[PDB]
């Protein structure tokens, strides 16, 4: 007999389909209403990137995989997955009062986004612990941070070193490997957020297994308020540094993101290929997790070492 455990995995959320993005982005924006030529120029976005229905079902897939791999790889817990999400339903509060209408009493939690901030992580766990307490009778453990699971590590490396195996000898000889992650409020700071730490350690151990010498880290994606944003941008970033050294290619991992969404088909494989074409500089930006096995097998060891049946 297994123990019955909720596997609750938390993200952003994405569209489902093309009338989707007003709803999406007004709740992103905090309400108000994305004006029509912003709703257009979204659609055209969506558009270039391949289309919308791939996205939601990337997370999805990531659950789901996640699950099955977890009860086949050890034998005394079974899981059940339950998608809880940000700016779309279903919500993180939607999930929790399904887990409680379906009888789990324990659960653990993850969020898709491997470093911890306050912005982001902490808020999705406490929502999902303070709807569980006013439920009653059901507990979640929640996992704080990933990016330091040596598998996590290694899928990067390894994606790194291919790439630059990859390239031609004058590339790799004068190449630029940018890290990043989704830009965030300066003002986390007042908080001691160690999210731009763990990017900067992400960075660091993925040159340092990749070999990779020359690097640097950037962030990207930074949304629309008043307020500063964490920088440099990686649009800016890449000029910046072609200017002072001469770079010819430009390498990015958006280890901050897990799947292929906006944030990397466009503003990577858009918006920071312009720069590199304008520049003269080759891009490349090696495969995002998604929901292939490697990565699968990185989270559910992060899951086991979180509940301790794992060293
Ligand atoms: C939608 C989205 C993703 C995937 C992500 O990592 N983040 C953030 O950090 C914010 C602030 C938002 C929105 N998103
Ligand atoms: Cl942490
Ligand atoms: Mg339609
Ligand atoms: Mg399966
Ligand atoms: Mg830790
Ligand atoms: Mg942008
Ligand atoms: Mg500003």
Known sequence: SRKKMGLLVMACGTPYKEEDIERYYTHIRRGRKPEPEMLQDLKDRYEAIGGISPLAQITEQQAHNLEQHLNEIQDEITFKAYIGLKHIEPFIEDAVAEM????????????????????????????????????????????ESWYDEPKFVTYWVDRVKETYASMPEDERENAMLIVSAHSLPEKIKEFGDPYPDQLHESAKLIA?????????????SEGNTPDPWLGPDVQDLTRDLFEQKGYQAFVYVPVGFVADHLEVLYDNDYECKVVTDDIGASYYRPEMPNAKPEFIDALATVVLKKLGRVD
């Not at 993850?110 to 006013?134: C, D, G, M």
Request: aromatic residues 8%; without cysteine; proline residues 2%.
């Open 100 to 143: 409680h209408k379906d009888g789990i009493t324990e659960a653990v939690s993850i969020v898709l986004a491997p470093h911890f901030s306050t912005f982001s992580v902490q808020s999705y766990n406490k929502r999902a612990k303070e709807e569980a307490e006013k439920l009653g009778g059901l507990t979640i453990t929640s996992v």
């Open 208 to 220: 340092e297994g990749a070999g990779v010498s020359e690097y640097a880290v950037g962030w990207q």
